[PDB]
Design an enzyme around this catalytic site. Sequence first.
Site, PDB file in Angstrom:
ATOM      1  N   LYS A 145      -2.219   4.058  -1.481  1.00  0.00           N
ATOM      2  CA  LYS A 145      -1.610   4.655  -0.322  1.00  0.00           C
ATOM      3  C   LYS A 145      -0.124   4.389  -0.483  1.00  0.00           C
ATOM      4  O   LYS A 145       0.295   3.233  -0.548  1.00  0.00           O
ATOM      5  CB  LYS A 145      -2.123   4.000   0.956  1.00  0.00           C
ATOM      6  N   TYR A 179      -1.967  -0.720  -0.948  1.00  0.00           N
ATOM      7  CA  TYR A 179      -1.194  -0.187   0.168  1.00  0.00           C
ATOM      8  C   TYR A 179       0.278  -0.539  -0.071  1.00  0.00           C
ATOM      9  O   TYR A 179       0.718  -1.667   0.168  1.00  0.00           O
ATOM     10  CB  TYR A 179      -1.679  -0.781   1.484  1.00  0.00           C
TER      11      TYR A 179
END
Lengths: 300, 303, 300, 301
Positions: free
Chosen positions: C167, C137
């Site tokens: 992400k 992330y």
Amino acid sequence: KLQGLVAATITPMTENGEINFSVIGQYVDYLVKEQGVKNIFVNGTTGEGLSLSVSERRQVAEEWVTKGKDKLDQVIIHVGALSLKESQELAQHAAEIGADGIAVIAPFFLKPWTKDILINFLKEVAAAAPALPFYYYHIPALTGVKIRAEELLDGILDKIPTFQGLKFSDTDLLDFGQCVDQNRQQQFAFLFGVDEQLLSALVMGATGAVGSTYNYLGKKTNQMLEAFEQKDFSLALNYQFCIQRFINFVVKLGFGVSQTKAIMTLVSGIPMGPPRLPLQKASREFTDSAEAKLKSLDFL
Amino acid sequence: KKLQGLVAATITPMTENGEINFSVIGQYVDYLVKEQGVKNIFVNGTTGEGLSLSVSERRQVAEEWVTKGKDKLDQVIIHVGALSLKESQELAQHAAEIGADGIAVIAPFFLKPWTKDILINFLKEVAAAAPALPFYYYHIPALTGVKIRAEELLDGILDKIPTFQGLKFSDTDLLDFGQCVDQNRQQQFAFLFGVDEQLLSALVMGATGAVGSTYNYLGKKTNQMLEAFEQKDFSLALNYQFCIQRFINFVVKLGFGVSQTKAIMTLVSGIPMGPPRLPLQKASREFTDSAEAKLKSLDFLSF
Amino acid sequence: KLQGLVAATITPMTENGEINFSVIGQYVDYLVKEQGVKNIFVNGTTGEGLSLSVSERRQVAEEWVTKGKDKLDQVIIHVGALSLKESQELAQHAAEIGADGIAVIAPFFLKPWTKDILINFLKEVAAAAPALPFYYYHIPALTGVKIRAEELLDGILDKIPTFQGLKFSDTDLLDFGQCVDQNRQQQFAFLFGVDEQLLSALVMGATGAVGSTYNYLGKKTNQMLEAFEQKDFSLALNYQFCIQRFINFVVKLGFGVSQTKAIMTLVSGIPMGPPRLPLQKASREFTDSAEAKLKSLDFL
Amino acid sequence: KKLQGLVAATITPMTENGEINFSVIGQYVDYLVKEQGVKNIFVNGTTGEGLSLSVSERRQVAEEWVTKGKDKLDQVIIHVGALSLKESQELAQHAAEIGADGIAVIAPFFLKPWTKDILINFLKEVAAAAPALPFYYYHIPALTGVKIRAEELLDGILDKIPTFQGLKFSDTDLLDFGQCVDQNRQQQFAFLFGVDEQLLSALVMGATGAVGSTYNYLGKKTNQMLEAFEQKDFSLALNYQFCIQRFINFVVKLGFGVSQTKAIMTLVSGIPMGPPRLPLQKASREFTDSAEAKLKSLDFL
């Protein structure tokens, strides 16, 4: 030696936005008589220096120097500009007119990548006034330049023989403290630039201060300096707190150069006029609130 | 009782395998008291890698510090700040159960509070889990990125947080710090400054003490500065401050964080602090040797 | 293959602040039926993930995985924490319950000094779930870690054999583009995280998207995705603009996780409840303004 | 008369002494048109070290660009931004006098404008010095630090600045850029994207052209990408963007500023751009050799 309080002067303007040269004599007289301020720093942020054209900057520097003669101890001209050529022109001019020194901010659009490149810029400006004292204007919040002042100063005389000190507008007192501590044999001016915590820099060896508030709080600031010099640090703090109560109050309202112009007009009675775009004149609400605060603290 | 003077932000000693080394905490307490003249500690702050530790680990290590501090330290303050309110409340209640002298809370910084009042509400709910324990706000904007000024937070704080007793201020904005002191004269607050390398500048602005990592191994030298200041030997105090600055600036230039503090403490104290936990990395041999040589050259360590 | 829209799920709460597990089944059904969203990302910022205790994170991950069975294609648990030990516990737990993958944010209390140190942290979390797909992330605005994602991904499989993508919550599409371009052989998910400009990442090779808006604008976003996949870029842009008109409006009012919670409640009719401190429940002024705007744009 | 497609942000050639090398500007114009397929230029912007030049230098070099661009370039746009309003007004009036096709203005960033409306008042006064000349706002928050969003500035702008014709948007925030496009459909504005390394991402969001430094030496390749996009060959367009990204990312990792641009242009075009002016430092031999090898490896040379 450049020492004690140095007012960062406002550039008075007419309502049409031209420089009001006609009140600079009055302004010099007022600093000396009413504020106990013997030194000025011309065309910094407070003077909207880089909003003025090169020819305007020359013309107003001429006025400060000539009106300061036999009245102010020192008139220091900020000659910084994004263009090296323009800075050089302004430095040469300051020498021609008999200013007492020049100061230079790091150029801040395309920033110097390194210490050495910044020093080369500074050296080329200094060399345009090769017998005039040269001061570095350290102000990382404005410039975005992350270079620590103590590191910039290390060996600086080998590169810039007219280097005579620093205006340090930053709250890092490790850096400021080490500027003082590491440069004991140079007779440099270590001038602190954050008015609202000047006492904290005095304790670390500041030799003076350059700032906008000395235009209209010079008397109280001089009382603080005198208390510090007498080693009455408790009393000096009480005086610093008076000053802080005003600055903290106006900072919460919205406080920049425009507001400084309005405050000076209010306190001195000398019309500073409006600022130049991209600044906007201070509001009536701000000016009323600031007036009331000044009165309540016995600054007016 | 008032929390004052030097407060060492304690290191969390670890084994080479990364587990907390509880066994050396008694020795560490004794060393602070005898060799550094440090009478107060601040546990599980940034120096203690507090937020790298699990809640269970934080409870266990707080217990050890409180137990080993009994009748030796004046005050043991537990940093109970966490990103989770629930966890912070758990740690606050636990600190009261074990008889810590106070608790401190950093502003949560995953989802930052939008306003002073919202932050106050978070702090209030943590403080209320230890309703008989002095509560200190831990202000450190460089780490948290929370742009809420400490003096604004303190204004009328007792109406919301009745246990509020002071501030750990790790920031160089002395308008903010100064106005904390100036605007809160009646409330009996501790105004503890958190930037060791410019402590003298905060003392002149009315700091009542200091919380920091350097007091673990420079507490004796720092106490000499405090005593010079108390005696109004301000020239001597400045000389002492500059000596400290010469060390700190030297290590800052090399890269100076919590890992390096652990290595320096091990070096000076002889007590094994061990490695730091990821995402910190153990300090280098080169760094530790350089720090040693600097400390010796300043007479902070013996040749 | 984790692909298409992935809703960053909200954590429903009771008025007293506990997790309202009872509505998670309804929420899953709503995502699948009303929003066309087949994947979820649990306990990210939108889920107030790090405001929850480790125990709460375990409990809610269990509810999402169980209620997602035979309904959602993928349930991804964000297991990031400031404490490596806690992250490892949550990773192991995600594997135990049969989540489809885990994601990890860089710890942001004491930041990793280098890429290698950050990868070592990530590796140790991934190793607690050593057969579970692992997603990084990337969200530099939150973490303050400034290392480019493409640099982080370079050689990552050598240290993290379970790595399956990222992400990317950042607008630097040179970096995102080069993540895609430099990692063609490895079958990674390149999931874009900035909902308000999703189309701009789709054209650069995004394989899906993870975001908060897909909870309540999934239908319109899926129309945009379908237009993009069919090469109707004029229509894709018009649908992107529909979404932007809403987001730009609410961002000007003040738009964060609390406001997302309120919007989901309004749009879905499923009570998300209050947020947890240090979030504050959205104002009536905000919800009235947002409701009016959603209506004016045919989202409600 | 519409500013569209690629706009090269031109370099200011200098001799080794740092003086402007006016003599090679004709050669540079011909090179842009012939070798790069670039029909528009943006003079004295960041790439041109514009704010490092004196007002007199900026006037002289603008004259040379306009003169050498006659009947060769479609449009010569002069960046007349300055920290001093008086200086920006002088340069704007001069651009009108010499027959430039338009002017652009950066937000002043010494003392930053507190609000959108105050910034508009500054821009209006500059625009009013060239009251018949198309006016472009130059948005570059990474350099200026001015936190005023472009779409907010554009909202009802024509009522204040009647010569307003578009935007040079050097920022990666495509919510802002997208809403510039979306909210100003009636206006026929130029929406020129300024981040070369992700141009395709802006094309899909409705960019009408691009202004940037790379089009000086990658204009031909970028034009192929633009063509692929206009011809609805989006897979080809992405392949071309990625090739360009491979080069730019390589130099970004090494340190890629205006100095490096000057050196790359010299290498690719054979026209001597010379050193940059302080506070920039000339690119190294190492860098130039690395960039050359990378360009060759991507068939950009």
